[PDB]
Amino acid sequence: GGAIKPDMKINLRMEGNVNGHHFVIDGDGTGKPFEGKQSMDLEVKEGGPLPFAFDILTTAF
């Protein structure tokens, strides 16, 4: 490897709009790139409670 470490932190911010509903979600997590695994804690900063299935957003984090 090198540039990428076996253990990485993850910083994230998602802003969006679904069927007219605006929202902002912050994310903080960690992962193991060479093991192909990651986890993150997400928090809806704006737009909560989301009026749609949270699942549609998951693969975008």
Partner: protein
């Protein structure tokens, strides 16, 4: 972030080779009932941290569909087909959401991946198995703990 995927030595790892500069992806999520979403993530890195700037837009979801009515349970595990289209790494997937009642809600994914730095070698046709899960969440999903495990491979028979 496809960087989080176990790539075997015999398959070119476009994502890990994209750093430190990074890469970005765009995706179209076409659901079977007309609902359509578009998303993009610009991924950079510094030190031991990946920075993600994400945008997500969805339209035309039926008022009484499983999405607006919150009737989904999870995405089923999947296998993403990775290949090059007109010089751009692309991933097509047959995705499916498990719904209450035990029926599935289909969504077709197409993600394009682009390295920031030029010259990053493109890989040949291959696969990436996925499994994303919401480990836990609070009542109104204002707080969610997500997790994903991904492994690349060459399919049968190898």
């Amino acid at each position: 972030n496809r960087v989080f995927a176990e790539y075997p030595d015999h398959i070119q790892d476009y994502f890990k080779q994209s750093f430190p500069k990074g890469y970005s992806w765009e995706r179209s999520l076409t659901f079977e009932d007309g609902g359509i979403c578009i998303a993009r993530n610009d991924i950079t890195m510094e030190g031991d941290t990946f920075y993600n700037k994400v945008r997500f837009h969805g339209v035309n979801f039926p008022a009484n569909g499983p999405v607006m009515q919150k009737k989904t349970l999870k995405w089923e595990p999947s296998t993403e087909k990775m290949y090059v289209r007109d010089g751009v790494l692309t991933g097509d997937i047959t995705m499916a959401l498990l719904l209450e009642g035990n029926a599935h809600y289909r969504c077709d994914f197409r993600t394009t991946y682009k390295a920031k730095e030029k010259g990053v070698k493109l890989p040949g046709y291959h696969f990436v198995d996925h499994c994303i899960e919401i480990l836990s969440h609070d009542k109104d999903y204002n707080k969610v703990k997500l997790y994903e495990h991904a492994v690349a491979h060459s399919g049968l028979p190898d």
